[PDB]
Design a protein around this ligand. Structure first.
Ligand code: HEM
Ligand code: HEM
Lengths: 175, 174
């Protein structure tokens, strides 16, 4: 099953360290997040794992060579980052979006510099009618915390991020 | 709302003319199809979504000539659920784009059939449906022959070597 739900509330596998309401309406602070594979709580986010939309074969080969698995023993820290991009983004053609995502913003090339420390999972949810477009998930050991914070500053300055209209960070610790 | 459901059964806006079970398991013949914007013998559903392959110049060409849905003359339609293979879905984005257009010329061929044929593309693989896409075409009867020719051109393409299941539900507006 390709559907995942993230329930902000009082139960779950993950303790909420902090929530940063980066842009637009935030998410209510809660004690924990419960993650269910499938479709007292304060909010629910859901999304699906999907096929590749932008990465080219050589980029997949580079990612496959180095990206770590989810659920490593040392990956006790995580961050759930729901993101919404603008109508102007979604109206663009496929070449126009690819050009912004990689040619201008270097999303893949830049992210690669933070592997293997950072593991990730990408879910999509615009097509479900959700309030966000994407749920991004990152997990890593404390030793990569500083590197992940650097990555966030670099991505938020990119051309791609000029099309982001809502964004929240839910910082988590594995219970 | 971006979700559409197609219910094969006794009620609906469309009378079934015939069903051709082109490849793989078919769909049960029924009297009518009921189309509902939102989430009898069978139900198919899918969502309208962003562009996945077409480039700007292709969209400009399509926008220059493609007709709208619900033309008064467009009393015939064809619902074509399609599933593609796992090997297709594993390919990277450039690999699929190259097959879809550089090799199979999906948009360039399809454009030869506008403005006669109007269309709508729905996606459903991500919903866990048994098909990956619901495709919808509609047109006046004078384009029936051209549309049957288009179908045979597409099925000869490299892109169609990855199609694993395909049904045609032919319909007439009530
Ligand atoms: C950690 C290293 C990272 C790597 C290796 C990476 C890589 C990728 C790749 C290859 C894709 C495209 C997948 C496809 O073709 O469909 C993607 C999508 C995306 N990534 Fe990252 N990423 C990283 C970090 C980040 C971070 C920190 C964020 C958010 C703050 C982010 C947000 C996104 C978004 C929103 C998308 C969807 C883009 C779209 O479809 O418009 N990524 N990522
Ligand atoms: C009538 C003229 C046609 C035109 C102008 C046309 C055009 C297109 C375009 C531009 C796309 C890509 C949309 C995107 O980038 O996301 C597409 C997708 C698709 N079309 Fe057509 N089409 C036509 C006929 C047909 C026919 C007759 C069929 C079925 C027999 C069909 C099956 C599909 C499928 C399954 C997809 C999804 C491709 C994928 O994402 O892998 N098309 N069509």
């Amino acid at each position: 099953n390709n559907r995942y739900s993230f329930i902000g509330g009082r139960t779950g596998q993950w303790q909420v360290v902090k929530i940063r309401n980066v842009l637009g309406p935030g998410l209510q602070l809660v004690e924990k997040v419960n993650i269910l594979n499938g479709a007292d709580s304060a909010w629910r986010l859901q999304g699906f794992a999907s096929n590749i939309r932008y990465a080219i074969r050589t980029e997949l080969e580079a990612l496959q060579a180095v990206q770590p698995m989810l659920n490593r023993a040392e990956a006790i820290l995580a961050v759930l980052i729901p993101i919404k991009k603008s109508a102007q983004w979604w109206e663009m053609a496929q070449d126009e979006r690819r050009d912004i995502f990689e040619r201008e913003s270097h999303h893949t090339a830049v992210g690669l510099e933070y592997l293997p420390g950072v593991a990730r999972r990408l879910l999509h949810c615009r097509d479900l009618g959700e309030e966000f477009d994407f749920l991004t998930w990152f997990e890593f050991a404390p030793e990569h915390s500083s590197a992940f914070n650097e990555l966030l500053l670099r991505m938020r300055a990119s051309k791609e991020w000029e099309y982001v209209e809502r964004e929240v960070e839910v910082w988590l610790k594995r219970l």
